[PDB]
Structures are given as C-alpha cells and as structure tokens.
C-alpha cells in the first residue's frame, strides 16, 4: 500500500474526490498500527495539527457504524484519549502528533492522506 500526503487544506468531501480524481485512489484506510505509525511519520513535518483519513461514520441512531470510504473492512482503530463518542462530527482526523484519531466536523479544511 502507498500513502500520499496532500498538504492543501480541503474539506473531507473535497479530499475524497480529489484522491479519486487526481490520484485515482481513495482516502487512506488504516488496518493496523504499523500503517498508522508510517502515516504519523509522513505527517510529522506538517505544521497542520490534524489530517483527514478515509474514516467516516455511516448509519443513524443506534445503528451508527464506522466505515472506510474505500469500502474495506473496519478492523483497526487508534483513538485518542476521550475519543471517539465526542460528538465532534462524522469524519475522522488523525492527530499529527502520536497518530491518535479524533472526530472532526467534515466541514473543516485539513490536509489529507490518499492511498494508492
């Protein structure tokens, strides 16, 4: 799997289409700790505090489940302390320090990681 850091600040919806349109790929799915760490290393030189990953919440009410926008199975999560269930939104952002994930409102411009 290859990861590409796009430093331009885009909303989550803009970032997913751009990966598909510019790089023929998707927002990164993260299936284990080694990938999370490799990405963390790739974003450590970002002055931006958070990056978009391909994680989103789907469904309603009690049937709320996490999904990858590439459709792969959700088998790993590296949540920050007090994350998720924070009500901060339906999209997932990786913290550039420590690689821990946080919920963010999809209407935020962040850098993002494509996988290809």
């Amino acid at each position: 799997c290859r990861y590409l850091l796009v430093r331009s600040l885009q909303t989550f919806s803009q970032a997913w289409f751009t990966c598909r349109r510019c790089y023929r790929g998707n927002l990164v799915s993260i299936h284990n700790f080694n990938i999370n760490y490799r990405i963390q290393c790739s974003v450590s030189a970002l002055n931006q505090g958070q990056v978009w990953i391909g994680g989103r919440i789907t469904g309603s009410g009690r049937c709320r489940r996490f999904q990858w926008v590439d459709g792969s199975r959700w088998n790993f999560a590296y949540w920050a302390a007090h994350q998720p269930w924070s009500r901060g939104g339906h999209c997932v952002a990786l913290c550039t320090r420590g690689g821990h994930w946080r919920r963010a409102h999809c209407l935020r411009r962040l850098p993002f990681i494509c996988s290809y």
Side-chain angles (χ1 to χ4, degrees), residues 20-39:
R20 290 183 69 185
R21 172 209 197 159
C22 301
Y23 309 115
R24 209 182 258 286
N26 282 287
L27 285 171
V28 67
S29 50
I30 306 179
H31 294 138
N32 60 63
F33 183 87
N34 318 340
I35 295 305
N36 195 78
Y37 181 88
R38 288 173 187 202
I39 292 162

Side-chain angles (χ1 to χ4, degrees), residues 16-67:
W16 181 36
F17 286 140
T18 58
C19 295
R20 290 183 69 185
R21 172 209 197 159
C22 301
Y23 309 115
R24 209 182 258 286
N26 282 287
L27 285 171
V28 67
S29 50
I30 306 179
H31 294 138
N32 60 63
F33 183 87
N34 318 340
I35 295 305
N36 195 78
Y37 181 88
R38 288 173 187 202
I39 292 162
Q40 182 195 347
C41 291
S42 191
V43 305
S44 61
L46 286 179
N47 312 77
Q48 290 298 300
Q50 296 185 122
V51 305
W52 292 124
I53 62 171
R56 66 175 190 171
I57 299 175
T58 61
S60 59
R62 295 182 180 176
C63 302
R64 281 177 58 175
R65 62 182 179 177
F66 293 100
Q67 293 189 335

Side-chain angles (χ1 to χ4, degrees), residues 3-23 25-28 39 42-43 46 48 50-54 92-94 96 108-115:
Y3 61 83
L4 178 68
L5 168 59
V6 190
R7 296 182 176 208
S8 64
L9 306 183
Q10 291 189 13
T11 65
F12 182 91
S13 303
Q14 286 168 326
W16 181 36
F17 286 140
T18 58
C19 295
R20 290 183 69 185
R21 172 209 197 159
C22 301
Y23 309 115
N26 282 287
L27 285 171
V28 67
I39 292 162
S42 191
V43 305
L46 286 179
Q48 290 298 300
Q50 296 185 122
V51 305
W52 292 124
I53 62 171
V92 188
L94 177 148
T96 54
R108 287 183 204 202
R109 297 184 32 268
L110 297 177
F112 57 97
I113 308 289
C114 303
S115 187

Side-chain angles (χ1 to χ4, degrees), residues 82-89 102-104:
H82 328 109
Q83 298 302 319
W85 327 130
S86 57
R87 183 185 179 187
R102 181 182 185 137
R103 286 178 62 181

Side-chain angles (χ1 to χ4, degrees), residues 63-79:
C63 302
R64 281 177 58 175
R65 62 182 179 177
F66 293 100
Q67 293 189 335
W68 300 118
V69 294
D70 70 350
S72 67
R73 191 183 179 277
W74 190 277
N75 67 340
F76 178 58
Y78 193 11
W79 293 113

